[PDB]
Amino acid sequence: MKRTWQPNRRKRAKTHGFRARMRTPGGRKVLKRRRQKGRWRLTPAVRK
Amino acid sequence: AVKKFKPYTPSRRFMTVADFSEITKTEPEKSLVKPLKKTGGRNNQGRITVRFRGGGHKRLYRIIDFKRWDKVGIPAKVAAIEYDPNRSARIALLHYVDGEKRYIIAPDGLQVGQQVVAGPDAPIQVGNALPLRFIPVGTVVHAVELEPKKGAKLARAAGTSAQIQGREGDYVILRLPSGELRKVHGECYATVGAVGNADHKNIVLGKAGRSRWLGRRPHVRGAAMNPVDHPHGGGEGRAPRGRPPASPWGWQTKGLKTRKRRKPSSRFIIA
RNA sequence: GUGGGAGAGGGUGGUGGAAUUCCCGGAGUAGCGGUGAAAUGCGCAGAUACCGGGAGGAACGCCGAUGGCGAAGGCAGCCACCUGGUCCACCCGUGACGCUGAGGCGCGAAAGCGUGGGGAGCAAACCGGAUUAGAUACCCGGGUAGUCCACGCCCUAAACG
RNA sequence: CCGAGGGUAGGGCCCGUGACUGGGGCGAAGUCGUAACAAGGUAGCUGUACCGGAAGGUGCGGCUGGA
RNA sequence: GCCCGGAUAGCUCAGUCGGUAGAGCAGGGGAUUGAAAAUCCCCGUGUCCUUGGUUCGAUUCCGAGUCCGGGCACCA
RNA sequence: AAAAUUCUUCA
RNA sequence: UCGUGGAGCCAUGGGGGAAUCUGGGCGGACCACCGCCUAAGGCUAAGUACUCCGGGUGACCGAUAGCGCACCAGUACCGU
RNA sequence: GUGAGACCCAGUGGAGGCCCGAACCGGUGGGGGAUGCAAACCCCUCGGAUGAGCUGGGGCUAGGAGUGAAAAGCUAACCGA
RNA sequence: GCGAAUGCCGGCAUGAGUAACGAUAAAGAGGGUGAGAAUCCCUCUCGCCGUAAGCCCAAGGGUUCCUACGCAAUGGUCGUCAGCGUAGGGUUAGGCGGGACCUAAGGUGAAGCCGAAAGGCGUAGCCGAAGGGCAGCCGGUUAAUAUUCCGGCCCUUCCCGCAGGUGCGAUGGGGGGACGCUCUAGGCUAGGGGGACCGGAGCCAUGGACGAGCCCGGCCAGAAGCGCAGGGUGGGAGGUAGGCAAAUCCGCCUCCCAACAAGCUCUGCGUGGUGGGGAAGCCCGCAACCCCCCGAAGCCAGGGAGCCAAGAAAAGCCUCUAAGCACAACCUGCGGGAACCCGUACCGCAAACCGACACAGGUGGGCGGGUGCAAGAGCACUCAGGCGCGCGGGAGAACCCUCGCCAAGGAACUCUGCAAGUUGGCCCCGUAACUUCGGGAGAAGGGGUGCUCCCUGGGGUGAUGAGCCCCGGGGAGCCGCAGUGAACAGGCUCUGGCGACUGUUUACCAAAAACACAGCUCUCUGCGAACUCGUAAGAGGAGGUAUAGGGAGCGACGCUUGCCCGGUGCCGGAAGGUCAAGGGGAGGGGUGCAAGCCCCGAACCGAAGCCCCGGUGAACGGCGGCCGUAACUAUAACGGUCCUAAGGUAGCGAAAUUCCUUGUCGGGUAAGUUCCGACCUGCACGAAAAGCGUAACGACCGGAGCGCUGUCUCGGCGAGGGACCCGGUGAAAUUGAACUGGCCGUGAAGAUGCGGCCUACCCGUGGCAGGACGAAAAGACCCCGUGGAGCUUUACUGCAGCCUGG
RNA sequence: GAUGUCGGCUCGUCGCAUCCUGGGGCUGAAGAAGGUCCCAAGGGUUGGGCUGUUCGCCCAUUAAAGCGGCACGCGAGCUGG
Ligand SMILES: NC[C@@H]1O[C@H](O[C@H]2[C@@H](O)[C@H](O[C@@H]3[C@@H](O)[C@H](N)C[C@H](N)[C@H]3O[C@H]3O[C@H](CO)[C@@H](O)[C@H](O)[C@H]3N)O[C@@H]2CO)[C@H](N)[C@@H](O)[C@@H]1O
Ligand SMILES: [Mg+2]
Ligand SMILES: [Mg+2]
Ligand SMILES: [Mg+2]
Ligand SMILES: [Mg+2]
Ligand SMILES: [Mg+2]
Ligand SMILES: [Mg+2]
Ligand SMILES: [Mg+2]
Ligand SMILES: [Mg+2]
Ligand SMILES: [Mg+2]
Ligand SMILES: [Mg+2]
Ligand SMILES: [Mg+2]
Ligand SMILES: [Mg+2]
Ligand SMILES: [Mg+2]
Ligand SMILES: [Mg+2]
Ligand SMILES: [Mg+2]
Ligand SMILES: [Mg+2]
Ligand SMILES: [Mg+2]
Ligand SMILES: [Mg+2]
Ligand SMILES: [Mg+2]
Ligand SMILES: [Mg+2]
Ligand SMILES: [Mg+2]
Ligand SMILES: [Mg+2]
Ligand SMILES: [Mg+2]
Ligand SMILES: [Mg+2]
Ligand SMILES: [Mg+2]
Ligand SMILES: [Mg+2]
Ligand SMILES: [Mg+2]
Ligand SMILES: [Mg+2]
Ligand SMILES: [Mg+2]
Ligand SMILES: [Mg+2]
Ligand SMILES: [Mg+2]
Ligand SMILES: [Mg+2]
Ligand SMILES: [Mg+2]
Ligand SMILES: [Mg+2]
Ligand SMILES: [Mg+2]
Ligand SMILES: [Mg+2]
Ligand SMILES: [Mg+2]
Ligand SMILES: [Mg+2]
Ligand SMILES: [Mg+2]
Ligand SMILES: [Mg+2]
Ligand SMILES: [Mg+2]
Ligand SMILES: [Mg+2]
Ligand SMILES: [Mg+2]
Ligand SMILES: [Mg+2]
Ligand SMILES: [Mg+2]
Ligand SMILES: [Mg+2]
Ligand SMILES: [Mg+2]
Ligand SMILES: [Mg+2]
Ligand SMILES: [Mg+2]
Ligand SMILES: [Mg+2]
Ligand SMILES: [Mg+2]
Ligand SMILES: [Mg+2]
Ligand SMILES: [Mg+2]
Ligand SMILES: [Mg+2]
Ligand SMILES: [Mg+2]
Ligand SMILES: [Mg+2]
Ligand SMILES: [Mg+2]
Ligand SMILES: [Mg+2]
Ligand SMILES: [Mg+2]
Ligand SMILES: [Mg+2]
Ligand SMILES: [Mg+2]
Ligand SMILES: [Mg+2]
Ligand SMILES: [Mg+2]
Ligand SMILES: [Mg+2]
Ligand SMILES: [Mg+2]
Ligand SMILES: [Mg+2]
Ligand SMILES: [Mg+2]
Ligand SMILES: [Mg+2]
Ligand SMILES: [Mg+2]
Ligand SMILES: [Mg+2]
Ligand SMILES: [Mg+2]
Ligand SMILES: [Mg+2]
Ligand SMILES: [Mg+2]
Ligand SMILES: [Mg+2]
Ligand SMILES: [Mg+2]
Ligand SMILES: [Mg+2]
Ligand SMILES: [Mg+2]
Ligand SMILES: [Mg+2]
Ligand SMILES: [Mg+2]
Ligand SMILES: [Mg+2]
Ligand SMILES: [Mg+2]
Ligand SMILES: [Mg+2]
Ligand SMILES: [Mg+2]
Ligand SMILES: [Mg+2]
Ligand SMILES: [Mg+2]
Ligand SMILES: [Mg+2]
Ligand SMILES: [Mg+2]
Ligand SMILES: [Mg+2]
Ligand SMILES: [Mg+2]
Ligand SMILES: [Mg+2]
Ligand SMILES: [Mg+2]
Ligand SMILES: [Mg+2]
Ligand SMILES: [Mg+2]
Ligand SMILES: [Mg+2]
Ligand SMILES: [Mg+2]
Ligand SMILES: [Mg+2]
Ligand SMILES: [Mg+2]
Ligand SMILES: [Mg+2]
Ligand SMILES: [Mg+2]
Ligand SMILES: [Mg+2]
Ligand SMILES: [Mg+2]
Ligand SMILES: [Mg+2]
Ligand SMILES: [Mg+2]
Ligand SMILES: [Mg+2]
Ligand SMILES: [Mg+2]
Ligand SMILES: [Mg+2]
Ligand SMILES: [Mg+2]
Ligand SMILES: [Mg+2]
Ligand SMILES: [Mg+2]
Ligand SMILES: [Mg+2]
Ligand SMILES: [Mg+2]
Ligand SMILES: [Mg+2]
Ligand SMILES: [Mg+2]
Ligand SMILES: [Mg+2]
Ligand SMILES: [Mg+2]
Ligand SMILES: [Mg+2]
Ligand SMILES: [Mg+2]
Ligand SMILES: [Mg+2]
Ligand SMILES: [Mg+2]
Ligand SMILES: [Mg+2]
Ligand SMILES: [Mg+2]
Ligand SMILES: [Mg+2]
Ligand SMILES: [Mg+2]
Ligand SMILES: [Mg+2]
Ligand SMILES: [Mg+2]
Ligand SMILES: [Mg+2]
Ligand SMILES: [Mg+2]
Ligand SMILES: [Mg+2]
Ligand SMILES: [Mg+2]
Ligand SMILES: [Mg+2]
Ligand SMILES: [Mg+2]
Ligand SMILES: [Mg+2]
Ligand SMILES: [Mg+2]
Ligand SMILES: [Mg+2]
Ligand SMILES: [Mg+2]
Ligand SMILES: [Mg+2]
Ligand SMILES: [Mg+2]
Ligand SMILES: [Mg+2]
Ligand SMILES: [Mg+2]
Ligand SMILES: [Mg+2]
Ligand SMILES: [Mg+2]
Ligand SMILES: [Mg+2]
Ligand SMILES: [Mg+2]
Ligand SMILES: [Mg+2]
Ligand SMILES: [Mg+2]
Ligand SMILES: [Mg+2]
Ligand SMILES: [Mg+2]
Ligand SMILES: [Mg+2]
Ligand SMILES: [Mg+2]
Ligand SMILES: [Mg+2]
Ligand SMILES: [Mg+2]
Ligand SMILES: [Mg+2]
Ligand SMILES: [Mg+2]
Ligand SMILES: [Mg+2]
Ligand SMILES: [Mg+2]
Ligand SMILES: [Mg+2]
Ligand SMILES: [Mg+2]
Ligand SMILES: [Mg+2]
Ligand SMILES: [Mg+2]
Ligand SMILES: [Mg+2]
Ligand SMILES: [Mg+2]
Ligand SMILES: [Mg+2]
Ligand SMILES: [Mg+2]
Ligand SMILES: [Mg+2]
Ligand SMILES: [Mg+2]
Ligand SMILES: [Mg+2]
Ligand SMILES: [Mg+2]
Ligand SMILES: [Mg+2]
Ligand SMILES: [Mg+2]
Ligand SMILES: [Mg+2]
Ligand SMILES: [Mg+2]
Ligand SMILES: [Mg+2]
Ligand SMILES: [Mg+2]
Ligand SMILES: [Mg+2]
Ligand SMILES: [Mg+2]
Ligand SMILES: [Mg+2]
Ligand SMILES: [Mg+2]
Ligand SMILES: [Mg+2]
Ligand SMILES: [Mg+2]
Ligand SMILES: [Mg+2]
Ligand SMILES: [Mg+2]
Ligand SMILES: [Mg+2]
């Protein structure tokens, strides 16, 4: 039956996008942390 | 008069609709004036703040004139009386000799073809709006302003109307639709006559829907929820509140007077 | 038919003044009320009594009768519109077209019911105070429906001459 | 083919009987009050309405077969 | 089975602090009536449940009991 | 205008 | 150090509201002496802290230890 | 049909949280399954199906908060926080 | 310094060659290939789907597409095969879809407002799409792309020039774009069915047929013009207080003309110069393209009618004028040029998406042929097309699963007819109580159904007459056990309880009597409303205004809804009592030689709240007890008395409530702790936590009947999928170590393990489940911990909020 | 750091304090019936109504419709009222 993960490119970006992270002081601190740690991807990568 | 249906289905037995002959004429709203995307939404910036609203047939809005003093002296012919979905009353479209058109919550009695106007000089007859001071004590008037130049705000619901009780200073007394006696300025306008379509109070929704088409979602009783949801809530199987009638926010709901005491708007009331 | 007459006959709209109750205002003070006697009850938080203004509902004093009109029920302030019945006068017209009337249809006090409105007074029930052997009553103090209007029902009566 | 009749199903009128229940009639001297007949000691009656152990009381209107 | 509450005149119920005990109703006797009611005068009544103990004295304060009452007996 | 209830049975 | 305490001192949201050296604050309520100090404007190196970074040491580890990674690791992989 | 009505017949008409019934949305009873085909499935049967209907896409509301035809249900496979 | 921590990381064991190998749609053979094939390729039989298990498109997935080499691993077996490994190829657009267009919710956000910071609101504007707007149809090619390349026919924008027209000209004004649901008319088209007619390779089989035989196919696109369907639409001429007057455009008045029109326009469909395609068939290569009929849910489209709940925006596009400009500039024709960016493979109800898997699950839109069954997207079969589900071969035990049948009986089964059976469609007769007059109703209970021949009535289409279809009517007669001959396809009734009803809910044990519901009542709220969210600004309420909005209980409808304001809550009380700051300072204290400077501080004046007074029940709530009495006894209409704020009215009653209880009668039954009707000493009904009823409705719960049955007496047989055997692949929880017998004892009280005795050669396979206090989960009950959380309140203490004096 | 809990079903097996059927002593045993006590389980020990019921109470029979234990025997056997 419908499972929790229903892929949608737009949603995925509109939600966890880079621009999206940047708007919120909280998301800003997310990218802050990610870069810090060493993550190769800061934003969940996707392409159109 | 109100249409009645044979019980060829339950609820349809108790169902009744309004007689639409008063309006029978021009069903399609005037492309100008009324045209106004009306935004639906049961909440503000985020959360809901008026429970149980939602759904309900798409409704187009119609802008009406609640301050006929715009066109003082300019008379108009009542072009037609149409149905307004966004209110209990029926509005009436009227072309002015000027050309400009606009709606007016149609008063009880007003008929298509009748001429009407607004102003001091204005004759005392159903449909003409005047400043209170120039209106015959005792006459019934509706769509009464409440403060000079601030627009109509009283007696606008179908069948409502207030009566001029007397003058006194620059003010005049009015017994409002609720029965309260309020002093209102003399310069305050109001259109003569009663609101009309008084049959309204008699339509019987009939089914559970219908009540839905009107945009009102199912409303659930306090004691049906639980301790956390409401204060009546909880109780091992059916129970008498627990005392004393309260709301989901927890304020007494049987008799506890709510209007602000120190409101400067008193001194002008009595009832 | 023509011409005149009397009437609370009926329906609608408008309207007048007196009175009661309530509201505001003044002035005023120790009781008012009610009764067979009282008590309950209202009153020093200022009542009753008096004056001025306002609201509202119901009923129309005198005229008024042992009177009038209506088929009956019933119908009374005033005004206007719509409308029924009726009496006399003239012998003009029709030419027996009449009487009654099972059934049907209509009307039908009050009380009662429905939808909504209205609510001053009165007032079943109900609550007090008395009386009483008791008093689910007669008397007193309160009091709801009702009484009121519109629409629809009900269709009974000592609807009696 | 029709057909006495039998079978199945569904209706109508009718009589009897039934835990129990509602009044009713009648039966010398049981109980409680006393509504009516004399303003019957609140004039009586009456249609309807509600209430009460019971007659009955009160409301509204009507009658006089009361003054 | 456990925890509660009483009981007093013929009846329904008051009261006590440890000294006294009451009322209403009933009832007995007269009065009014022609006679009953009603009403009016007069009047008598108590092991304060039994029970031991304390105390100078107990209906009353303790201990045991009888009766008539009411209230709990849950998690399984 | 009245404070006030009643009277076994059969003759 | 100060928890209303005999509670000053330093700040200050509210109200009231001065003076310019006979001015004005302080010395633990408050007075009196005696003494200290100059508010309502600003700047000021050094001594001090830390270790992304470079070096040097180690009665530090030696691939289940030592950093999570001695290796193409914040990867593979898990999670929206 | 009556004074006029009400009302009564047919015919036309095509209303309705109406009916059977798919697609579709559900999830009644029983059976199986229970290291499954499956972290809720399959079979037979059953509720609704012009509505308070179902559904695609685009949006908004969240942790003592949301949302709730109300179960303390749901809020990314265990929500009295 | 390890042996234990259900310890941690790793490795390897046991169960075990065991379960299992993922739909019971199904296979067989012959050719190839190759080291090796049930499993790869080819052919021929066979079975499965065919509102698909087939085609097309979104989303998502991202090379899985195509070709050549390949087989370690991946694939539940095998593998030469592959969605797998290596390598090389492959995605072509002015017209398709997005962007150099529009706006929606919402987002963002100049200004502007707010907030300790972070930030929150927020006008214009901007962003934002399956909505609006916008120009491509039919073929042909590749191993792999095509509305993209190619062919033919047909278009759209810009730019320039030319010629002829004209007041040209906005981001501004106006029109338009522009809208719901249900039902519908007429033409068309898609699509499909016939043909004796047209075109075809061929075919006479096995008894018959050279046949109006059999089989295959008889279309697609197409400018202008022309037709046939429609859709939109009055022109005039004056005025002109409005369109935030800029207008000759709208809009209003007024009046010549014109009307179920015509004309003007704009689509649809035919037709059209011409281009294209074109089967069954053998060696693999022969072309017609015409005539009838059924016919949309699509088109003409913005058509029509009815209805109440009253049904986006913006741009493009018309039109009006402003600045400006009129050498401009737009408009129409006609030629020339110019025309970018992104996507385009492939999968796409699934093995490529979401479910750790090649997972029996989930996934939006379009096409979805034919025949028959009343219809249909249902059901059976079948086209096109696609599959036989990536382990097989045997055997023919028990046992389980799914499935068929049964003597006599027919619910005796059992908590229960659970389950399964019966019944089942359509046509016709015929249908009760009750009822809100709709319904109950498909009530029940019946009869009919096939095929053949004759006679016969309407309709559409033609043309009135043939065909082709479309509804019937009446007869004769034929064969079966049976005519919806297969498939799909209600068992019926009587009587109670609950809820009126359709509806909603515990995703994953509860679908109900619970929630909701129209409807009734109470209460608040006069507008900058009350109420809600927010520190705020602001927002919802509501671009509403008491016939409206909030809160609360009840819950259609009928008859109704009683008594008690003592306590509590709320409402009303300008008096009193109490009352905090603060006001006021009688009077007192510390100090100073003093003026002073500093403290305490009584009267009285001091709000809300409380006290007090009065109201209030569809506000929280409450709504009694004991003696006595009638001329048989009983019983008690009557009397007395205690207590209260007042003593439970109507109605109902051993009930979803009754303990004593299976009360007690009566009905039903052979028999009835249930059921139905009564009674009433109601442990412990009762009137809007509504009381008593009620037609209709219910996958709701109880009691009965009839019908039919393997539910049962009582079991038997049979089918298929497993189980079993062989070949291939090959797990799991569990597991101190084992060489692991019975009884009577004993033992921490239930011993394979101690004692005594009795049995017992060693080792397996298929079964059964009594024990190993079998596994599983550090018991969910219970208690314990001065553990935790959710909830309550007249627990404590605070806070928001609200009231209030200064 | 779990010994699954009432009743039913299936399958049984055991005790004797025996409900039948066998023997036998008294009897207030005529016969037939019975009563009672002794020996004796070898084998028997029904089908239904009602309730979840064990238990009983009825219905119709019977030679009898025995009492009781095996974790109120038996849920890695079933059922869950
Ligand atoms: N009279 C019969 C009807 O019922 C009622 O009357 C009945 C009763 O009221 C009446 O009862 C009376 C009583 O009132 C009066 N005070 C005492 C008397 N002993 C009784 O009398 C009754 O009972 C006795 C036995 O006890 C019998 O012998 C006698 O016949 C009988 N009538 O007896 C009647 C029975 O017949 C109505 N009042 C009357 O109007 C009506 O018609
Ligand atoms: Mg996942
Ligand atoms: Mg998308
Ligand atoms: Mg991104
Ligand atoms: Mg509700
Ligand atoms: Mg609940
Ligand atoms: Mg509360
Ligand atoms: Mg609460
Ligand atoms: Mg409660
Ligand atoms: Mg309860
Ligand atoms: Mg009064
Ligand atoms: Mg006065
Ligand atoms: Mg005064
Ligand atoms: Mg009159
Ligand atoms: Mg007249
Ligand atoms: Mg003559
Ligand atoms: Mg009448
Ligand atoms: Mg009347
Ligand atoms: Mg009544
Ligand atoms: Mg009534
Ligand atoms: Mg009165
Ligand atoms: Mg007396
Ligand atoms: Mg009237
Ligand atoms: Mg009548
Ligand atoms: Mg008379
Ligand atoms: Mg009788
Ligand atoms: Mg009698
Ligand atoms: Mg009398
Ligand atoms: Mg009398
Ligand atoms: Mg009197
Ligand atoms: Mg009298
Ligand atoms: Mg009478
Ligand atoms: Mg009575
Ligand atoms: Mg009575
Ligand atoms: Mg009585
Ligand atoms: Mg009375
Ligand atoms: Mg009278
Ligand atoms: Mg009369
Ligand atoms: Mg009279
Ligand atoms: Mg008189
Ligand atoms: Mg005595
Ligand atoms: Mg007497
Ligand atoms: Mg006598
Ligand atoms: Mg006597
Ligand atoms: Mg302290
Ligand atoms: Mg200082
Ligand atoms: Mg200082
Ligand atoms: Mg100092
Ligand atoms: Mg200093
Ligand atoms: Mg500095
Ligand atoms: Mg510095
Ligand atoms: Mg490491
Ligand atoms: Mg090593
Ligand atoms: Mg990821
Ligand atoms: Mg007539
Ligand atoms: Mg009709
Ligand atoms: Mg329906
Ligand atoms: Mg199961
Ligand atoms: Mg199982
Ligand atoms: Mg179904
Ligand atoms: Mg249906
Ligand atoms: Mg959505
Ligand atoms: Mg979305
Ligand atoms: Mg939380
Ligand atoms: Mg919901
Ligand atoms: Mg919550
Ligand atoms: Mg160790
Ligand atoms: Mg292993
Ligand atoms: Mg094994
Ligand atoms: Mg095996
Ligand atoms: Mg196997
Ligand atoms: Mg397989
Ligand atoms: Mg070879
Ligand atoms: Mg894609
Ligand atoms: Mg790859
Ligand atoms: Mg090759
Ligand atoms: Mg392999
Ligand atoms: Mg090979
Ligand atoms: Mg491939
Ligand atoms: Mg490959
Ligand atoms: Mg493009
Ligand atoms: Mg560009
Ligand atoms: Mg914003
Ligand atoms: Mg913002
Ligand atoms: Mg855009
Ligand atoms: Mg678009
Ligand atoms: Mg569109
Ligand atoms: Mg579009
Ligand atoms: Mg558009
Ligand atoms: Mg395009
Ligand atoms: Mg084209
Ligand atoms: Mg392809
Ligand atoms: Mg122009
Ligand atoms: Mg425009
Ligand atoms: Mg349009
Ligand atoms: Mg058509
Ligand atoms: Mg065609
Ligand atoms: Mg054909
Ligand atoms: Mg032959
Ligand atoms: Mg065609
Ligand atoms: Mg003009
Ligand atoms: Mg301008
Ligand atoms: Mg053509
Ligand atoms: Mg046709
Ligand atoms: Mg100009
Ligand atoms: Mg070119
Ligand atoms: Mg493609
Ligand atoms: Mg699909
Ligand atoms: Mg996956
Ligand atoms: Mg597979
Ligand atoms: Mg799958
Ligand atoms: Mg789907
Ligand atoms: Mg069919
Ligand atoms: Mg099918
Ligand atoms: Mg059989
Ligand atoms: Mg048989
Ligand atoms: Mg049975
Ligand atoms: Mg049985
Ligand atoms: Mg049973
Ligand atoms: Mg049951
Ligand atoms: Mg069944
Ligand atoms: Mg009848
Ligand atoms: Mg045949
Ligand atoms: Mg069939
Ligand atoms: Mg079926
Ligand atoms: Mg039935
Ligand atoms: Mg229901
Ligand atoms: Mg439905
Ligand atoms: Mg659900
Ligand atoms: Mg559930
Ligand atoms: Mg259900
Ligand atoms: Mg369920
Ligand atoms: Mg708004
Ligand atoms: Mg309200
Ligand atoms: Mg409301
Ligand atoms: Mg309720
Ligand atoms: Mg109810
Ligand atoms: Mg009540
Ligand atoms: Mg009270
Ligand atoms: Mg009170
Ligand atoms: Mg007050
Ligand atoms: Mg003070
Ligand atoms: Mg005060
Ligand atoms: Mg009493
Ligand atoms: Mg006696
Ligand atoms: Mg006696
Ligand atoms: Mg009671
Ligand atoms: Mg009562
Ligand atoms: Mg009873
Ligand atoms: Mg019973
Ligand atoms: Mg009870
Ligand atoms: Mg019982
Ligand atoms: Mg019981
Ligand atoms: Mg019986
Ligand atoms: Mg039962
Ligand atoms: Mg039974
Ligand atoms: Mg019963
Ligand atoms: Mg109750
Ligand atoms: Mg209540
Ligand atoms: Mg009931
Ligand atoms: Mg149901
Ligand atoms: Mg069987
Ligand atoms: Mg088999
Ligand atoms: Mg094997
Ligand atoms: Mg042992
Ligand atoms: Mg050993
Ligand atoms: Mg040993
Ligand atoms: Mg074995
Ligand atoms: Mg075992
Ligand atoms: Mg086993
Ligand atoms: Mg265990
Ligand atoms: Mg534990
Ligand atoms: Mg403690
Ligand atoms: Mg918590
Ligand atoms: Mg406290
Ligand atoms: Mg263990
Ligand atoms: Mg035995
Ligand atoms: Mg046994
Ligand atoms: Mg056991
Ligand atoms: Mg079990
Ligand atoms: Mg066991
Ligand atoms: Mg098991
Ligand atoms: Mg159960």
Coordinates of N, CA, C and O (backbone and C1' of nucleotides) in Angstrom, one line a residue, chain I residues 463-478:
Chain I
rA463 P -33.6 9.3 -49.9 O5' -35.0 9.5 -49.2 C5' -35.9 10.5 -49.6 C4' -37.3 9.9 -49.7 C3' -37.8 8.9 -48.7 O3' -39.2 9.1 -48.4 C1' -38.0 8.0 -50.8
rU464 P -39.7 9.4 -46.9 O5' -40.9 8.4 -46.7 C5' -40.8 7.0 -47.3 C4' -42.2 6.4 -47.3 C3' -42.2 5.0 -48.0 O3' -43.1 4.2 -47.3 C1' -43.8 6.6 -49.0
rG465 P -42.8 2.6 -47.3 O5' -43.2 2.1 -48.8 C5' -43.6 0.8 -49.0 C4' -42.7 0.0 -50.0 C3' -41.2 0.3 -49.8 O3' -40.6 -0.9 -50.0 C1' -41.9 0.7 -52.0
rA466 P -40.8 -2.1 -48.9 O5' -39.7 -3.2 -49.3 C5' -39.7 -3.8 -50.6 C4' -38.3 -4.0 -51.1 C3' -37.4 -4.5 -50.0 O3' -37.5 -5.9 -49.9 C1' -36.3 -2.9 -51.3
rG467 P -37.2 -6.6 -48.5 O5' -35.6 -6.8 -48.6 C5' -34.8 -6.6 -47.4 C4' -33.5 -6.0 -47.8 C3' -32.6 -5.7 -46.6 O3' -31.9 -6.8 -46.3 C1' -32.8 -3.7 -47.9
rC468 P -32.0 -7.5 -44.8 O5' -31.2 -6.4 -43.9 C5' -29.9 -6.1 -44.2 C4' -29.5 -4.8 -43.5 C3' -30.0 -4.6 -42.1 O3' -29.2 -5.3 -41.2 C1' -30.5 -2.7 -43.3
rC469 P -29.7 -6.7 -40.5 O5' -29.6 -6.5 -39.0 C5' -30.7 -5.9 -38.3 C4' -30.4 -4.4 -38.0 C3' -31.2 -3.9 -36.8 O3' -30.6 -4.2 -35.6 C1' -31.4 -2.4 -38.6
rC470 P -31.5 -4.9 -34.4 O5' -32.6 -3.7 -34.2 C5' -32.2 -2.4 -33.7 C4' -33.4 -1.7 -33.1 C3' -34.3 -2.6 -32.4 O3' -33.9 -2.9 -31.1 C1' -35.5 -1.2 -33.9
rC471 P -34.6 -4.1 -30.3 O5' -35.8 -3.4 -29.5 C5' -36.9 -4.2 -29.0 C4' -38.1 -3.3 -28.9 C3' -39.4 -4.1 -28.7 O3' -39.5 -4.5 -27.4 C1' -39.7 -2.6 -30.5
rG472 P -39.4 -6.0 -27.0 O5' -40.0 -6.8 -28.2 C5' -41.2 -7.6 -28.1 C4' -42.4 -6.8 -28.3 C3' -43.7 -7.6 -28.5 O3' -44.3 -8.0 -27.2 C1' -43.6 -6.0 -30.2
rG473 P -44.9 -9.4 -27.1 O5' -46.2 -9.4 -28.0 C5' -47.4 -8.6 -27.7 C4' -48.5 -8.9 -28.7 C3' -48.8 -10.4 -28.9 O3' -49.7 -10.8 -27.9 C1' -48.6 -9.4 -31.0
rG474 P -49.7 -12.4 -27.4 O5' -50.5 -13.1 -28.6 C5' -51.9 -13.0 -28.8 C4' -52.3 -13.8 -30.0 C3' -51.9 -15.2 -30.0 O3' -52.9 -16.0 -29.3 C1' -51.3 -14.3 -32.1
rG475 P -52.5 -17.3 -28.5 O5' -52.5 -18.5 -29.6 C5' -51.7 -18.4 -30.8 C4' -52.3 -19.1 -31.9 C3' -51.9 -20.6 -32.0 O3' -53.0 -21.4 -31.5 C1' -51.1 -19.6 -33.9
rA476 P -52.8 -22.9 -31.1 O5' -52.5 -23.6 -32.5 C5' -51.9 -24.9 -32.5 C4' -51.3 -25.2 -33.8 C3' -50.2 -26.2 -33.8 O3' -50.8 -27.5 -33.8 C1' -49.4 -24.3 -35.0
rG477 P -50.5 -28.5 -32.6 O5' -49.0 -29.0 -32.8 C5' -48.6 -29.7 -34.0 C4' -47.2 -29.5 -34.3 C3' -46.1 -30.1 -33.3 O3' -45.9 -31.4 -33.6 C1' -45.5 -27.9 -33.9
rC478 P -45.2 -32.4 -32.5 O5' -43.7 -31.9 -32.6 C5' -42.8 -32.2 -33.8 C4' -41.4 -31.9 -33.4 C3' -40.9 -32.6 -32.1 O3' -40.6 -34.0 -32.3 C1' -40.1 -30.4 -32.2

